[PDB]
Amino acid sequence: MNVIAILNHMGVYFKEEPIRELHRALERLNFQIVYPNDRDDLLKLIENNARLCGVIFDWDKYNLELCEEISKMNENLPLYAFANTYSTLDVSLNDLRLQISFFEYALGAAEDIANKIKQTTDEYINTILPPLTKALFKYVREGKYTFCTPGHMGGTAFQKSPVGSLFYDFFGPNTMKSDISISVSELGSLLDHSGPHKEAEQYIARVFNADRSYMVTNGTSTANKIVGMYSAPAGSTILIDRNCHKSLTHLMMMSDVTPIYFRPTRNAYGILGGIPQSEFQHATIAKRVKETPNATWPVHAVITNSTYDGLLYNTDFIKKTLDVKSIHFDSAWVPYTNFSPIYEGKCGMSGGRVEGKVIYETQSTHLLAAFSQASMIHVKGDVNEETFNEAYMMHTTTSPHYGIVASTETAAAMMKGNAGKRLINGSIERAIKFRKEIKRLRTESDGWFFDVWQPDHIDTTECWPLRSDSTWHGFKNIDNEHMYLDPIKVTLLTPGMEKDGTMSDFGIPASIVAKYLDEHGIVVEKTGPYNLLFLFSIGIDKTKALSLLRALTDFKRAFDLNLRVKNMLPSLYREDPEFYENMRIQELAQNIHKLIVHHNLPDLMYRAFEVLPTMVMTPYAAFQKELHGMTEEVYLDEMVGRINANMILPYPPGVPLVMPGEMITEESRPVLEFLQMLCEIGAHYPGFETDIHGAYRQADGRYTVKVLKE
Amino acid sequence: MNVIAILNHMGVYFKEEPIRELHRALERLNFQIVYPNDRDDLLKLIENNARLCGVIFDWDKYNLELCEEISKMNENLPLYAFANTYSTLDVSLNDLRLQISFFEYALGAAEDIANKIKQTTDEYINTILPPLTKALFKYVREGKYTFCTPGHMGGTAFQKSPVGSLFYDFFGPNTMKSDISISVSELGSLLDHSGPHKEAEQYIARVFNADRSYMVTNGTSTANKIVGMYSAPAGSTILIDRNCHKSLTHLMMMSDVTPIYFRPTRNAYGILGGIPQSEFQHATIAKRVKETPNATWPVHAVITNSTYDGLLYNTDFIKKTLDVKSIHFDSAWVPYTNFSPIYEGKCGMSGGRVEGKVIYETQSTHLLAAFSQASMIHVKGDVNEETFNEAYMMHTTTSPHYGIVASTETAAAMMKGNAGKRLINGSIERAIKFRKEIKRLRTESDGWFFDVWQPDHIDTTECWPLRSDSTWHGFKNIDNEHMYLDPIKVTLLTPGMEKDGTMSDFGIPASIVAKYLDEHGIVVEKTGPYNLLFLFSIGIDKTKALSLLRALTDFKRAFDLNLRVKNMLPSLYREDPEFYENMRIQELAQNIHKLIVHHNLPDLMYRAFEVLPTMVMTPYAAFQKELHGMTEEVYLDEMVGRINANMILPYPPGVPLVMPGEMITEESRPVLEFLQMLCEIGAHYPGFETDIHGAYRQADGRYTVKVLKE
Amino acid sequence: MNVIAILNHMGVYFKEEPIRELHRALERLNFQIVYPNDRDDLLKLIENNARLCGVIFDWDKYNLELCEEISKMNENLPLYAFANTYSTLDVSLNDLRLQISFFEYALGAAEDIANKIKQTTDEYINTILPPLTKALFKYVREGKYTFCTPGHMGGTAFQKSPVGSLFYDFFGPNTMKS
């Protein structure tokens, strides 16, 4: 932070010479002076460079031309205004709130003015930096504790070791010294929620519109279990989205609870739809309580809001309708709802308390930018603070990393205020630009191209509603004014399926487009049989957009030339030279596509997940048997009529198929048929193997599963 | 890594000029040349500087004088030997294993020789560096994934933000880029234990003498729960050291188990003694099974080996004697046992398997040097790998930090081989030196001084045995050839108690010595009423030893002058100027000491922990009530006859006093008397407050505790 | 292969200063910068000089005036395009097949951008060179076979002989080692 811009020649020595003296005095005080070519260049420098930290200018020549323009960009930026004859305090200025220091052009003033500017900059720096990190830097500068642990002693031991020097040499002293313990007692305490730790909680709780906010450093995996174990008593029944995370299965195995499942809808594509309004209404729930063996009224519900594909609930309706005392919105996908008005009435925290209920959001901070494992628990309502805090303290890491904690606090510091508001606004604007760019290239090229899966026109900047009277989304009998498409989540479609969900004769499975992009280091966020997703973050610049956009036109060009796999996919070639020697990219695509077409994969996959295996015992009940080691393996073929010991998690489509305690019967035979079909279709091409978790491929090529012993 | 030493003038141009040409050629290839004044300076440079990475010398002038000396220090260090007339392959060399490249002094050779040396150094570097970190650096150099998350995009977002720049500016690009996800698929997988992750496990498992080793990144807190939940079935009885960690209480509350406690011995000082041999013998355990309500034969035992004060068990005796199928040595204090022969027969992993039993060590790597939260599970025996691995995967962080994992791997890299063996040997040697230094200063000074708590003579370098025929240790009727003192753990004694455990008229409580050292930034590892501990690590150098040694003589000097608290403890003074205005350091000491003497604190503390509160219900049973919110607060005075809801953990002495479900009665009245006494003695001086966890100081100054409702 | 052409003054510090920083950063990375007097001089340089291996330009000032003209001469030639306000992905570009990397004018970017350009140039070089000659050069750089024949040992014997040095001195190590 040392670049000072100067903008001018004035035509008079009495002005020019003091600025020369000040230039020189400031350079001696370790400032880099930069000189925008013109007024517009200066505004672009500021706009793009946060390291520009002051502007010197002639008051008369520039004040009415600059002051408001700069204040729009950054209201703390130091301005050093030099006066002429007519320079003064005009009544027009009286009403503006500006951060202004007035200075004259004089030789020999730089020493004192520089010292004041230094002090005033430190004052501004001190205001904007968060206090815990500020104190940490001060310790690293001043403190003198020797004869101390950690044994590495500020990384010292790493430097005398070539092997340790590799790790130290990269990270360096500061990184090594920031790994501190409670021996630095003046930073307060996380466990007492005291000092700069309280200041952080209030800052966050106020920013994110929560009653109370906890900082969790082991992800939403851990936030779920802290909320779960406090929330789900033994012997109780819970309503749980059949679309649930594994960490909630691990909770069920550890707690004696009976699940009744909210039942999402699904369309032919396999895209999950929302739990319909009926699922929340007292009459519907009461009926399932009647139909579920040993069920009682639910004590805790967990809803995933939004769905992945951007269907958000009318949360005003849910909070009013769902008659459950404890409602936990796992809102991992929507951490940003407080920051766009388009999400009002469509998020957990929106509005005020819900009388008679505690509402949770658990959020995976790491659709924002933060270190992996950073998660928040946002509580809207009361807990038993002593029992909740004991629950928190029992599940706290053994050695908390002092950076991870600061990384989550500094992630907010970055996104804070205007400039973070303007950053996200910019990304929304470019999202819509890119959307229209795909349409352009679709026009310009002869023959097949990518398309976008979206409404016919997007004349409106919002999360576009999905309506029952529209066909573009492919869902059947959708609720209206219920689901909305987030502009920044861009799905692309590859050739292979019809707008119906029926199959084309010509197809290019998306997995092949991924292999190509993988040779070129470009990662596809998410891929399905014929779909690819791209996220337009604040990362994504003009260089990356051009490289991606160009890479996509290069795929088409290379595909259409029918390049040899040998030439287009050299790393794949090296896996089996003979297998791949003569194959061309279009033949690889044809063969895999023909398999998909023939094996009717989408229909079989759809049907496997539309019925439920039979719950013979609960996951917890089966785990009691496992706890005593009462498990054997059987072959996959032999599994009908047996009680499964493990979750069986196949890829595709990546969601649980059989739970511990469930059994395939005749009612649920399509389950087994899908599984056997996956083993067959995936046995053909090296690099395109079957993948089913919970099934064990024996060295002989047969699959086993774990079952309960009799 | 670029410093090359040259050692010589030879008196002939045909030798000197090529070395000039090579000096210049090497400087142009970015080597720093250094010139030891003499042969001894070179050996000291090598000994102290790992960045010296090559030595050029005249073969004849130096080979018989240098080769073996350097090979003793570092057997990979590149040597570049220049030949004369008599230089050749003498039969005497045939048997030595050396890393030698032979070169001639010639102009113009540096370009090619430098390139070979560069390549040969990279080959050596590549051998010594561990492969996962090596691959990570290569990615950071070569890879080109754009349009990607993490959103911060290699820290890019931090740089445009003064607040984020504070965090980035300190850590920098490399630190920011090493926070990666499984998108970098070529590093293998932790969860599959595959690729460079397997290579790490084998490396560690072989180094630490285990059958199998797991890498845990959430401390031994988490290692305990992974082993616990696999090991302790519901309805079973467990033998557990009444000296247990809180994380094992949190396990008991979560699992339906019945505890029977191994009962340590204790002496008047309050120092824990070992569970006697009788506690392991079948007849003793059988008798407690009879006497314990609803007890069955134990399925799992947890012993803390060693004790803190260095009493190690004959583990050969325990493994042979203790008739329990599952024995878990929580060996957090003894991570280094594999590396000194003095610990043979005295650690969990020593020797081979124990037929018919699984033996665990859980170790807190962070008495070594590693990041906080680093812990290992070392298994000696078989587990059900699928159920154990499912247990591991359920308790794995949400977002693993990729550095923490490398920090534990690089901590081993540092300590590896000879140089890490010589480092620890050096620390043992200095420990004994310092021990004799305290004795010297004790002689030189008139009047009182510090003493060391150790045997009368230490003519032997080992862990000295504590014997029943010796009085120095203060324990009553100790087992012989049972406990040993680790030389590197140095306890110092302050005036105040007699060698009996009886009280002196003159005392200086250790807490006051801590306040002094705290003003000077010096931390005391561990303090008790009249004791202070110092660890002589590989960190501790001559500068730190002198500063500590001098700081200790300065305390005496300043104490004996009776400086004003105002002058000697200015920060304490600022807390209450009026309170402290006229008080001198000796008066502060007197008043606090007189309190200790009068309140007979050691006797009362000793007695509070020698009886056990009555277990009315188990901690788990009480938690069922808490699970339903059935808790109220009562005042401390009102607690006899009530069932405690929380653990009550007082400081001092820092170990549990009452468990959930326990009740103070008449049998255990000294418990309440100690607690009330602590509230009284600690109410006198600002900065010397009472501290009891589980008791809540109300704003009015009264204490409450949580109890079960009736 | 190290001559990079720069074609411009733009009249604004926010553009000119990053290009100054990049000029200097690139010169430190061992590039020779050349400056065509004008657009036509640049096209003649390219047309006549295969050692010109990259062009840096302002996207708006020059893209519609240069892109097609350069693509007619050499379709692998690295272009480093710097963006302004109106710079973006216009539907008109969607159909052209071009080798384009997009970059911004920024101080301190040269170290990373230079490394990417170096890598991208090596990728282009590696595509165009035939693989046997490529492998031969790699051996001459890395391999370490000593105690070997040919007896001349990479021409070594020629250098100690004035008569043999006449033949070696002219051809040199590379010719002798191939």
Short mmCIF file of all heavy atoms in Angstrom, two decimals, chain A residues 145-153, chain B residues 523 535 537 539-540, unseen atoms left out:
data_model
loop_
_atom_site.label_atom_id
_atom_site.label_comp_id
_atom_site.label_asym_id
_atom_site.label_seq_id
_atom_site.Cartn_x
_atom_site.Cartn_y
_atom_site.Cartn_z
N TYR A 145 8.78 -13.97 23.42
CA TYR A 145 8.75 -15.23 24.17
C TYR A 145 9.71 -16.29 23.62
O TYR A 145 9.45 -16.91 22.57
CB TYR A 145 7.35 -15.82 24.20
N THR A 146 10.81 -16.52 24.34
CA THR A 146 11.76 -17.58 23.99
C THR A 146 11.76 -18.69 25.07
O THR A 146 11.31 -18.47 26.18
CB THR A 146 13.19 -17.02 23.75
N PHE A 147 12.27 -19.87 24.72
CA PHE A 147 12.28 -21.05 25.62
C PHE A 147 10.94 -21.75 25.66
O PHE A 147 10.61 -22.52 26.58
CB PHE A 147 12.82 -20.69 27.02
N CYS A 148 10.21 -21.49 24.58
CA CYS A 148 8.82 -21.76 24.40
C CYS A 148 8.61 -22.91 23.45
O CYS A 148 9.49 -23.21 22.65
CB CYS A 148 8.28 -20.57 23.63
N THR A 149 7.42 -23.51 23.47
CA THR A 149 6.96 -24.27 22.31
C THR A 149 6.02 -23.33 21.49
O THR A 149 5.79 -22.18 21.90
CB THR A 149 6.27 -25.60 22.71
N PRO A 150 5.53 -23.77 20.32
CA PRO A 150 5.77 -24.99 19.54
C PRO A 150 7.26 -25.30 19.33
O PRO A 150 8.09 -24.39 19.23
CB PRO A 150 5.13 -24.69 18.18
N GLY A 151 7.60 -26.59 19.30
CA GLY A 151 8.99 -26.98 19.12
C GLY A 151 9.67 -26.41 17.88
O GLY A 151 10.88 -26.19 17.88
N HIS A 152 8.90 -26.16 16.83
CA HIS A 152 9.54 -25.63 15.64
C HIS A 152 10.01 -24.19 15.80
O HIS A 152 10.81 -23.71 14.99
CB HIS A 152 8.69 -25.82 14.38
N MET A 153 9.51 -23.51 16.84
CA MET A 153 9.98 -22.16 17.19
C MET A 153 10.00 -21.20 16.02
O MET A 153 11.07 -20.84 15.51
CB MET A 153 11.35 -22.27 17.83
N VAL B 523 7.41 -17.41 29.48
CA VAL B 523 6.34 -18.31 29.88
C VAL B 523 6.88 -19.50 30.68
O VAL B 523 7.89 -20.09 30.35
CB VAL B 523 5.57 -18.79 28.62
N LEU B 535 11.20 -26.87 29.75
CA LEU B 535 11.50 -27.90 28.78
C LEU B 535 12.68 -27.47 27.89
O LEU B 535 12.68 -26.37 27.33
CB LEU B 535 10.25 -28.20 27.95
N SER B 537 14.10 -27.98 24.74
CA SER B 537 13.80 -28.51 23.43
C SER B 537 14.93 -28.23 22.45
O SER B 537 16.03 -27.80 22.82
CB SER B 537 12.49 -27.90 22.94
N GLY B 539 14.46 -26.10 19.65
CA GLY B 539 14.47 -24.62 20.04
C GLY B 539 15.29 -23.81 20.95
O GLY B 539 15.56 -22.65 20.66
N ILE B 540 15.64 -24.39 22.08
CA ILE B 540 16.34 -23.67 23.11
C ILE B 540 17.81 -23.55 22.75
O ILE B 540 18.52 -24.55 22.70
CB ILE B 540 16.18 -24.41 24.44
#
